[PDB]
């Protein structure tokens, strides 16, 4: 399986990161907030764990959403 | 439970210092250190090693200490493996 990560940056609004986590990773508001804070403080955080193709899909959906909303948010994946 | 130690890319820390860190604190061969350094540059983040919780914390701390004493903002953290 493969974990999907988001990386911190100084441009993407916190509220957008929460939105991404809720929408694309089905996080509750509190859990999304938790992960958003963790990424802000530590530079990176885990959004979910999926089979390879599904991880690729989620990474792509996040990047598509971010860029269309004019945010440079970086999303990537690693073997879990 | 084991924990992976990660570094994050930045635009300031020199490539050669990252290789030095990988060799000094994570027992990487020159080739592996170079490849991880390049991977982090390309991907934004990369895995330095996997250790028990407290050893991972120790490595993270040693990297931050070394980086700041070398005048570099290199970010290092850990996650459950
Ligand atoms: Mg694992
Ligand atoms: Mg990771």
HSE-CB at A27 with a 13 A cutoff on CA atoms is 20
The DSSP element (H or E) to which B61 belongs, if any, is helix B53-69
Instruction: Give how far B65 is from chain A: nearest CA, Å.
Output: 16
Domain A1-80 bears CATH identifier 3.30.559.30: no
Query: Where are the domains positioned within chain A?
Result: 1-80
CA B19 to chain centre: 9
Instruction: Give A-chain residues touching B75 at CB under 8 angstroms.
Output: 42-43
What is the distance between the alpha carbons of residues A61 and A10, in angstroms, rounded to a whole number?
Answer: 21
List the one residue out of B3, B4, B19, B8 whose CA is nearest residue B45.
B8
**Is some CB atom of chain B closer than 8 A to the CB atom of A59?**
no
Way the structure was solved? X-ray
Which of B4, B67, B79 to probe by mutation at the A interface, max A CB count within 10 Å?
B79
Instruction: Report the CATH number of the B1-81 domain.
Output: 3.30.1390.10
- Resolution of this PDB entry, in A? 1.4
């Amino acid at each position: 399986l493969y974990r999907v990560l988001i990386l911190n940056d100084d441009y993407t609004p916190a509220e957008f990161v929460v939105y991404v986590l809720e929408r694309f990773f089905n996080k509750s508001r509190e859990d999304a907030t938790r992960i958003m804070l963790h990424v802000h403080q530590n530079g990176v955080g885990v959004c979910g764990v999926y089979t390879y193709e599904v991880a690729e899909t989620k990474v792509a959906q996040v990047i598509d959403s971010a860029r269309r909303h004019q945010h440079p948010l970086q999303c990537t994946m690693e073997k879990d």
